[PDB]
Write a protein that binds this DNA or RNA. Structure first.
Ligand SMILES: [Zn+2]
Length: 241
RNA sequence: GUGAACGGUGGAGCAACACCUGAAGGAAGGCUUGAUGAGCGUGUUCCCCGCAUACGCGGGG
């Protein structure tokens, strides 16, 4: 519940691969997940391929992967956590917009860990911190480390439901990009320029990029009700074995 | 040791093909280069204006 690699044996039960070396000597942190490798725990020397391009998100330059993050670099872990929230009892999916509606509005009370892929297969699990508090959520989205406050998401959603109550067409006040890629991601629309007051506009610039990315999955004409995502920890474990 | 440090928006692509500014329409009706200025009458002291300042000068008809 402290390091992102803890879910290897806390969220989902797993063990070392038994071809891993035993650490002898002084303390050194794992290159992935920033977990200190003590004396006696199993570790692997660093054998990343040339296709690994996340050297900028490595926690340390010790060139040693802890066994939990050896499990975390496995391909079934890589496509199993392409969109997943890992609570203290299981791994659930956030692929649907109703699942992100559940995650960023009334979050689960566990100290979870949120990963989401901005591409096909990405190293997501180890390079994000564990969110200890529901109010402050660390979301990994591709090369982006995002922080989402569900209270600010609730305030923006209440603002949007106020300015779009009674109207026939649900027009968004501020445009949000799902990929977080367009220039106008966070830019105020003309309808939102005419239908929001000044302090609401400064609020919509003042939100964090993670809240913008979350609102991108929950600001559209059909509004997703918070529905808990389907539990996928059985699918990941079966794939892992 | 600025959640830092590192990171090319890139490569290629014909605005081009054909198209009559053209048809019709009177610069005319009337008007002396001919004159005009070229030569033809008065016969002796009479008014008025200035410079002067009256010794005289210029001058109107
Ligand atoms: Zn690790």
């Amino acid at each position: 519940m402290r390091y992102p690699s803890d879910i290897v044996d806390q969220v989902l039960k797993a063990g070392p691969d038994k071809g891993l070396l035993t650490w002898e000597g002084v303390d050194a942190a794992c290159s992935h997940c920033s977990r200190p490798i003590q004396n006696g725990d199993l570790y692997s020397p660093s054998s990343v391929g040339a296709f690994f391009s996340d050297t900028r998100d490595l926690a340390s330059t010790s060139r040693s992967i802890c066994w939990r993050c050896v499990v975390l670099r496995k391909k079934p872990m890589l496509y199993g956590l392409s969109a997943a929230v890992v609570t203290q009892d299981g791994i659930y999916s956030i692929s649907k917009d109703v699942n992100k509606a559940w995650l960023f509005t009334t979050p689960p009370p566990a100290p979870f860990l949120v990963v989401h892929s901005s591409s096909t297969m990405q190293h997501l699990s180890w390079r994000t911190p564990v969110t200890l508090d529901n109010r402050r959520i660390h979301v990994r989205y591709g090369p982006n480390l995002f922080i989402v406050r569900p209270e600010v998401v609730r305030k923006a959603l209440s603002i949007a439901d106020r300015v779009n109550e009674g109207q026939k067409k649900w027009v968004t006040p501020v445009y949000f990009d799902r990929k977080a890629a367009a220039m106008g991601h966070g830019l105020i629309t003309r309808a939102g320029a005419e239908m929001l007051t000044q302090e609401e506009q400064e609020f919509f610039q003042s939100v964090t990029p993670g809240e913008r990315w979350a609102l991108s999955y929950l600001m559209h004409s059909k509004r997703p009700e918070p529905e808990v995502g389907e539990c996928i920890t059985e699918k990941v474990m079966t794939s892992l074995n």
